[PDB]
């Protein structure tokens, strides 16, 4: 999807970039926005709202949106119903930010960042978009979630390691 | 019914401490294999419904059904003391249904509450604790009761079971030796 | 591109072709398996009955449906990944065989045509090939076929002249 | 009958049948074809059957037997329905009763056990026909007679096998893994019910000294434990 | 025969009625034997059959009125076997009465799929007659039909189990022949039956509240809002004279379906939820009846639970073991997703 969006951004009129940004930030499979934000067309000052959205979806949390809602189309999102798809994504991205800092996340911290009920909290963790993004074990008794371009680089390294691991397992089986 | 139901249930439990036979058991089996299941009309069907109700742990339903089977039958109306026996049977059925419940549901329940159970079966705790403890001790059930907090525990032992199996095997071997001789 | 042929698939195709050869009537059947990546696994086959009709229209959809349903009660439950035939003419003698393949390709564009020669197949030489149609150009091309066998199958095969979880993980 | 020969194709067909399901615990069942009209039974082909076992009872699809056999006959009438096979690795308690079913299609029924796990190198196959020695002063009792086996091939297959051994000379699997994980997340209750079953088998044997039934139960329990270990 | 049956109904002679029925069976068995013999009644002739079929139809009717349900069920197949042999169609009057009887039998039988089928057969037949008909009835009947289909016990079958054993249910249903007996090609699922409910004609005459209910439960079911939706929808049904009447008799099974769904969804949402919260989350007649339902859902394998009465908590799975195999089951799902994703990526590559 990043490929398709970058190709479109680098062929379409600059007037189409705002809509492209709304499309990106609403897309069910997209969680990484750095490459799109870095596009020279993306960079331009005039699409200030678009730039703000990129900062918001590339770098910020749900809290950052709330802080800036009067200067971003939160109201427009409400009119549209676009935001909930966007709201969901920003909350998912917030979990990703938290997981980067710590591989054990207390429920109380998540709820504040989450701005959602603790009972609901697990459901939100439960939802599949979250599951693909994260693999973790919920500990109800301890009230925590154990969750073991820049990001892509790190991911790549992991993938390589993963492959090596799988190979080991396969090798063993082959032996038997 | 009163005699063979809890022992059946336990067998459903599979603890299999003891084997018991209950009259009209064959009739119940026939009904289960029946293509058609009607709401009870003949008396044996009312008794039947009371049995299944005991199995699922609705004692109120069971008590209701006996009258319903009975009313067409007029079976309980033929006794002068019928009220007395109605309440007496209501009590004995309360007890045995409590037993049956415990037998069937101990799989998914690791722990229990004697207060709640007492209220809901309409059986005072002195009866509850007694029945449960007695039964557990008699059937060698891996169940533990704290009288202080009034709570029960199950779902366990492995090591002991294996020990038993070993014994049995040894017995079989001995038998074979006899034939060999 | 590679067609991986299983032990039972290869033995059934050689057996059927040879049985067909005694008959003097050309033998065809269906190949069952999995399209994996580009590559295709042929895990099993079954024979189609001899028909008066030659080449296309040979297939009997009532026989096929019955056979497929009864196999499904059987474990394998594998897509039809193509067809095999034994055809004497070489090399690439007959136009008619290709059209059959076009019918298979229209049902599933990944379909493969295997051809085996039961007369020229001799100890040390199996004469077999696998084809697809091309998408002044030639109409078709051939992809080399490899054989897949499990360790259990290898041990089993070794009884001639004797003097599951793992597969899943893989 | 004095002996049995089995074609390599049959061995590979039984393994392929077992392989597709991907169940270690499960034992697969099918039909064997060939020629049993002499003292040497020749087993030359086979096909899989839908088969399920519940408790002692097992279901075989009679219509499947008839319908598949009818197609087999259209391919090659020389390969007659001569018995059945299963993946074993050992005789099971229900086998004499299952064998009585196959008797309807043909007699005497022949049972080929193909050990698709291949624990023993020498034999991938055990062959049995049902017969009773009998007891004097008593009614005869049915039992399986063990017949010697060899693996033999016609020229076509010999050529094929030699060619195959030249170089020597996933979603379903994931689902199975998930099922194993579920079993693990439950095994404390299944342990206690396999402990009881084990005891039951012992009881049966005692009675015999029924015995067969008990033995089967014990075997089942052991199998269930082995499958739990493999999963782990 | 007609006179004899009227006698049995009028004087509640149930014992004799059963014997009457058996006599009629023996008589009919004889005719096939009789037919080879000279002077035998001709079961080939339409008038002869129409009379025989007319009798059996009445046999079913009296059976229902005498509440002899087992006898009713036997007489239904008696009727069925004659209809197959039957060339001339029955009077639609007497035929619609027949179907209206099947709905009662099957409600008492606890076979809800057959119940709804019989309703539909009657509706399709009552639409034609009268040629001019009340719209107020079409309102209530269509609603009834639809409600009875939502109210049907869940037909869902586990995916893991089915592939390995193709096993669902107890499983056993001795009234299985009857589905073939109603010209149904095979036993249906509740989802399947519902689609006919889904179809506009059932929908068009169908009270709106039921369409909403279907949305709330079958389309977009969310536990965090279902209780509210139901609370606002349940008032409307009670007020209506006809809707309430249709509704009154399906309250139980409907409630069962809804609660079953709530237990499943809670099983998905939680790992170990408090007994107070779980019971609180889903409405119940009584706190203990809610526990009963939860266990029943567990026995029928719609959910696996371990209920710890000491701490008042429920777990939808020794402790570390249950966490290990939950982790494994999560990892597996994750792998599956990744695999599927990779497939999608392949397509993107071409782009």
Coordinates of C-alpha atoms in Angstrom, one line a residue, chain B residues 32-39 41 105 107-113 120 151-152, chain E residues 67 69-70 73 108-110 173-176 288 298 305-311:
Chain B
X32 CA -33.9 -40.5 24.4
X33 CA -33.6 -42.7 21.3
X34 CA -37.2 -41.7 20.3
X35 CA -37.6 -39.8 17.0
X36 CA -40.3 -37.7 18.6
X37 CA -40.1 -36.0 22.1
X38 CA -43.5 -34.8 23.3
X39 CA -44.4 -32.7 26.3
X41 CA -48.7 -36.9 29.0
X105 CA -20.9 -29.7 37.2
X107 CA -15.8 -30.5 35.9
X108 CA -16.0 -26.9 35.0
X109 CA -16.1 -25.5 38.5
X110 CA -12.9 -25.4 40.4
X111 CA -14.5 -23.7 43.4
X112 CA -17.9 -23.3 45.1
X113 CA -19.9 -21.2 47.6
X120 CA -30.5 -21.5 45.6
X151 CA -15.6 -23.1 50.1
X152 CA -15.0 -26.2 48.0
Chain E
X67 CA -52.8 -33.7 22.6
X69 CA -48.3 -35.8 20.2
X70 CA -46.5 -39.1 19.7
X73 CA -46.1 -37.5 14.7
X108 CA -44.3 -29.2 21.2
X109 CA -41.6 -31.5 19.6
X110 CA -38.9 -28.9 20.2
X173 CA -31.8 -36.3 16.1
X174 CA -34.4 -39.1 15.7
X175 CA -36.7 -36.8 13.8
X176 CA -34.2 -36.6 11.0
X288 CA -28.1 -18.1 39.3
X298 CA -20.0 -24.8 28.1
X305 CA -14.8 -22.1 31.1
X306 CA -13.4 -22.7 34.5
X307 CA -15.5 -21.1 37.2
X308 CA -13.7 -20.4 40.5
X309 CA -16.5 -19.8 43.1
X310 CA -13.9 -18.8 45.8
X311 CA -12.7 -15.6 44.0

